[PDB]
């Protein structure tokens, strides 16, 4: 009496849908033999073996470390220095960045043109970068030609000279460089955050320095700065790839001389005038901008503080989300799940910055001006739930992720040498892989709760926002959202 199941349009489509759902039903065990979605803690002792890190201090007090591996055809050499933008006087602020830009153009024995043609002819190149507490000059070169690179490095570090017309053209290009740092606003937000969370202390200042100061930066400042802060004990010479420790130490003992021997260590410059975290906010309102950016941050741990490992585990378990990621709404952490399901942001990225004697720990989201309060609510809810009721699968997953990230980042010779230099400046020694793992898997739910109570629970905050932020909750809202009255 009724039509057959094929006579009408909707019946056929319904049958097709049920056919697909049928062909989704039964799985195959042989494709489900080795993997599980439940995190577990596993030991990696039999793969963590790696070559040695020969460190040889010298009678002048200049440490030298190498990670020798004699199968490669390239090597990298550099000079990490324990000086940076923290150690200026607010009347010569950007002197470090200026000195970095200028050290590449003197060297009376070989003029600038000679420098770049020489480095280009062999096929290698060298870089340089600075920060608030470190400065780097490293040369990536071919294995056959390490001694030439070492000679270049020694000469540019020691016998540099500075000229007035050189000064003028460099100050013009640096004024330009300042003029194009304002178009990305992530570094603008972070400069404002660092200059309000650390007001009236050396960490407040910016790396570039005021344009009121870049104009009056003549050679006297450069010479005094290089003779004061570039001393023998505050330098480390590193090298990875295909090198030999004994040759390198030979010509290091031969070429590296004439260094100023000053009795001034970084620790005894940081001991007086330390970093003090206050807690404030800066709200920049423009309203002609389509998107709003803001960051909220507590205080943190030091380099040698034992709790920095737990802080990094926490940052891993408060992960990052982005609108073009493959996770979506299935991304493990609860904060990323809330942001992804409710579509209340463009991107968020928890951060963790360490220093000697202080640190920071925050979130930094970006979103439309009509979802700001929901975003802030979710952010603070998860930030406090860490201190209240941290689970166990979360902690195992976060420990796994931290292990994988830390090891997978080490790849090549530049990362290896950068690791060696940075760690020899911060910890005074290079942490092996085994000790780092044994420290990482020693953080449990109880330790997460304890450290969160120490750092997160009912402490002050620092906020920095920019754009159309007329719907962002005030400071008292954020301050009061650091505890729960139900417990």
């Amino acid at each position: 009496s009724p039509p057959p199941p094929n006579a009408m349009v909707y019946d056929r489509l319904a049958e097709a849908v049920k056919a697909k759902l049928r062909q989704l039903e039964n799985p195959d065990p042989r494709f489900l033999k080795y993997g599980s979605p439940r995190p577990t803690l596993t030991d990696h002792t039999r793969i963590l073996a790696a070559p040695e890190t020969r460190v040889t201090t010298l009678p002048n007090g200049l440490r030298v470390a190498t990670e020798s591996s004699l199968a490669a055809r390239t090597a990298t050499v550099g000079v990490w220095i324990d000086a940076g933008s923290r150690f200026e006087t607010e009347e010569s602020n950007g002197t470090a960045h200026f000195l970095e830009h200028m050290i590449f153009k003197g060297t009376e024995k070989r003029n600038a043109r000679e420098l770049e043609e020489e480095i280009e002819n062999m096929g290698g190149h060298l870089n340089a970068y600075t920060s608030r507490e470190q400065t780097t000059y490293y040369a990536k070169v071919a294995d056959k030609d390490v001694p030439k690179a070492l000679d270049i490095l020694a000469d540019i570090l020691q016998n540099s000279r500075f000229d007035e017309n050189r000064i003028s053209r460099e100050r013009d290009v640096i004024l330009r460089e300042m003029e194009e740092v304002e178009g990305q606003t992530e570094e603008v937000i972070f400069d404002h955050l660092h200059a309000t969370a650390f007001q009236y202390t050396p960490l407040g200042r910016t790396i570039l320095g005021p344009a009121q100061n870049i104009k009056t930066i003549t050679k006297d400042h450069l010479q005094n700065y290089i003779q004061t802060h570039y001393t023998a004990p505050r330098m480390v010479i590193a090298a990875s790839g295909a090198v030999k420790h004994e040759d390198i130490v030979e010509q290091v003992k031969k070429l590296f001389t004439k260094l100023s021997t000053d009795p001034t260590t970084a620790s005894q410059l940081v001991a007086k005038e330390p970093a003090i975290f206050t807690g404030s906010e800066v709200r920049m309102l423009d309203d002609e901008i389509p998107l709003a950016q803001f960051a909220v941050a507590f205080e943190g741990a030091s380099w040698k503080d034992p709790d920095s490992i737990a802080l990094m585990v926490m940052q891993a378990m408060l992960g990052s989300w982005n609108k073009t990621a493959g996770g979506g709404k299935h991304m493990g952490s609860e904060l990323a799940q809330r942001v992804g399901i409710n579509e209340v942001a463009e991107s968020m990225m928890a951060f963790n910055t360490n220093y000697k004697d202080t640190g920071l720990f925050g979130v930094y989201a970006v979103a439309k001006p009509d979802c700001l309060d929901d975003l802030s609510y979710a952010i603070m809810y998860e930030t406090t739930k860490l201190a209240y009721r941290v689970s166990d699968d979360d902690v195992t997953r976060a420990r796994n992720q931290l292990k994988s990230s830390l090891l997978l980042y080490i790849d090549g010779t530049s990362p290896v040498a950068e690791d060696i230099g940075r760690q020899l400046l911060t910890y005074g020694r290079r942490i092996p892989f085994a000790e780092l793992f044994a420290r990482i898997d020693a953080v449990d739910a109880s330790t997460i709760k304890r450290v969160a109570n120490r750092f997160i629970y009912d402490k002050d905050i620092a906020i920095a926002a920019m754009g159309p932020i007329q719907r962002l909750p005030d400071y008292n809202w954020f301050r009061r959202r650091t505890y729960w009255n139900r417990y």
Binding site: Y388, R389, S391, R486, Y487
Partner: peptide
């Protein structure tokens, strides 16, 4: 997850009982 919740429930019960013995002050009980 259970222990923290149940401990908080017990302490809230203690608070409720203390409030009750504040509103009423019976020495016969």
């Amino acid at each position: 997850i259970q222990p923290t919740d149940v401990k908080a429930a017990a302490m809230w019960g203690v608070a409720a009982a203390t409030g009750g013995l504040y509103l009423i002050q019976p020495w016969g009980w």
